[PDB]
Scaffold this motif. Structure first.
Motif, PDB file in Angstrom:
ATOM      1  N   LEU A 186       4.198  -1.151  13.172  1.00 28.78           N
ATOM      2  CA  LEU A 186       3.151  -0.780  12.181  1.00 28.78           C
ATOM      3  C   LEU A 186       2.948   0.732  12.349  1.00 28.78           C
ATOM      4  N   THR A 187       2.642   1.448  11.301  1.00 26.56           N
ATOM      5  CA  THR A 187       2.426   2.887  11.310  1.00 26.56           C
ATOM      6  C   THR A 187       0.961   3.265  11.420  1.00 26.56           C
ATOM      7  N   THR A 188       0.066   2.268  11.459  1.00 27.53           N
ATOM      8  CA  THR A 188      -1.389   2.445  11.724  1.00 27.53           C
ATOM      9  C   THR A 188      -1.756   1.572  12.925  1.00 27.53           C
ATOM     10  N   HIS A 244       4.845   0.874   0.927  1.00 29.79           N
ATOM     11  CA  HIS A 244       5.222  -0.133   1.895  1.00 29.79           C
ATOM     12  C   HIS A 244       4.861  -1.511   1.414  1.00 29.79           C
ATOM     13  N   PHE A 281       0.384 -14.437   9.052  1.00 25.82           N
ATOM     14  CA  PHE A 281       0.575 -13.045   9.313  1.00 25.82           C
ATOM     15  C   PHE A 281       0.116 -12.709  10.678  1.00 25.82           C
ATOM     16  N   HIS A 296       0.863  -1.155   0.000  1.00 27.89           N
ATOM     17  CA  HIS A 296       0.000   0.000   0.000  1.00 27.89           C
ATOM     18  C   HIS A 296       0.919   1.229   0.000  1.00 27.89           C
TER      19      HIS A 296
HETATM   20  N1  LIG Z   1       0.612  -4.982   8.304  1.00 21.71           N
HETATM   21  C1  LIG Z   1       0.562  -3.637   8.096  1.00 21.71           C
HETATM   22  C2  LIG Z   1      -0.710  -3.083   8.189  1.00 21.71           C
HETATM   23  C3  LIG Z   1      -0.868  -1.732   7.975  1.00 21.71           C
HETATM   24  C4  LIG Z   1       0.293  -1.036   7.791  1.00 21.71           C
HETATM   25  C5  LIG Z   1       1.469  -1.642   7.813  1.00 21.71           C
HETATM   26  C6  LIG Z   1       1.715  -2.941   7.946  1.00 21.71           C
HETATM   27  S1  LIG Z   1       2.734  -0.512   7.579  1.00 21.71           S
HETATM   28  O1  LIG Z   1       3.544  -1.010   6.453  1.00 21.71           O
HETATM   29  O2  LIG Z   1       3.443  -0.299   8.828  1.00 21.71           O
HETATM   30  N2  LIG Z   1       1.842   0.783   7.218  1.00 21.71           N
HETATM   31  C7  LIG Z   1       0.533   0.409   7.468  1.00 21.71           C
HETATM   32  O3  LIG Z   1      -0.447   1.073   7.264  1.00 21.71           O
END
Ligand SMILES: Nc1ccc2c(c1)S(=O)(=O)NC2=O
Ligand SMILES: [Zn+2]
Length: 256
Positions: free
Chosen positions: A193-195, A115, A126, A90
């Motif tokens: 994770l950033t969210t 990412h 996962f 994404h």
């Molecule tokens: N497994 C993930 C789910 C959401 C996100 C990420 C990983 S991220 O690449 O940290 N940036 C995100 O939004």
């Protein structure tokens, strides 16, 4: 949670107290503090057999999903132990070309950030991987506005079909190699994770070399909607978390 005044990043810690944790992402990559580690092996990106399935607007970004039921697209090497399997990619982007990335480089914001999310196959899937401190590897690639990226255009062209939250579209035979810069030189550090849920499970691998996309390409990202069909239109822009404190961590560079 989302990205607005009222429920954006500054609010997330109330539901997700780990937001103020010891290894949160993204961070500013201060290039003159990063340590060159002549022992970090080259990154191995093996995307030959990647099987894309679907693209989804989740209300926060759009995700291109892969078949991860076998080792088919994998990341190895660099700072990684073992084999990490691609699950999705994404982006994060801005309302303006001057912002949009999550990581920054010497405080520089890029127009967007890609990412590519992989999970450690020692953990089986996962969902179990995100409970582990070495569960994920996310390959982060900056986007700057200049020349078009032809390998992005299939993505750009399907966005109209997933304008609103909850919409998905078949997205088969998409080759994520087309999104990589020439160089695989990188910085790496342990993060999150950033969210939400902001889990502290990620080895970040952030490429030095940005890709260039056209203005027209990023404009089409900006036509997406955070809202669902039938609701008031809230444009999907500025879906980035700003830099978090580095705290007790070291960023390593694969290059001088
Ligand atoms: N497994 C993930 C789910 C959401 C996100 C990420 C990983 S991220 O690449 O940290 N940036 C995100 O939004
Ligand atoms: Zn992301």
């Amino acid at each position: 949670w989302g990205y607005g005044k009222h429920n954006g990043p500054e609010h997330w810690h109330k539901d997700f107290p780990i937001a103020k944790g010891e290894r949160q992402s993204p961070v500013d990559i201060d290039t003159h503090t990063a340590k060159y580690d002549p022992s970090l092996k080259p990154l191995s990106v093996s995307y030959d057999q990647a099987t894309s399935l679907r693209i989804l607007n989740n209300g926060h970004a759009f995700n291109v999903e892969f078949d991860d039921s076998q080792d088919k697209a994998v990341l190895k090497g660099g700072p990684l132990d073992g084999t990490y399997r691609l699950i999705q990619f994404h982006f994060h982007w801005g309302s303006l070309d001057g912002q949009g990335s999550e990581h920054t480089v010497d405080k520089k914001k890029y127009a967007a950030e890609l990412h590519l999310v992989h999970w450690n196959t020692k953990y089986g899937d996962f969902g179990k991987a995100v409970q582990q401190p070495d569960g994920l590897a996310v390959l982060g690639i900056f986007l700057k506005v200049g020349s078009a990226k032809p390998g992005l255009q299939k993505v750009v062209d399907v966005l109209d079909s997933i304008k609103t939250k909850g919409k998905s579209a078949d997205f088969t035979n998409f080759d994520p190699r087309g999104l990589l810069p020439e160089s695989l030189d990188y910085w790496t550090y342990p993060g999150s994770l950033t969210t939400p849920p902001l889990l502290e499970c990620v080895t970040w691998i952030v490429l030095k070399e940005p890709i260039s996309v056209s203005s027209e390409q990023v404009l089409k990202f900006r036509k997406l909607n955070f809202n669902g069909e039938g609701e008031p239109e809230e444009l999907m822009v500025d879906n980035w978390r700003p830099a978090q404190p580095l705290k007790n961590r070291q960023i390593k560079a694969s290059f001088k």
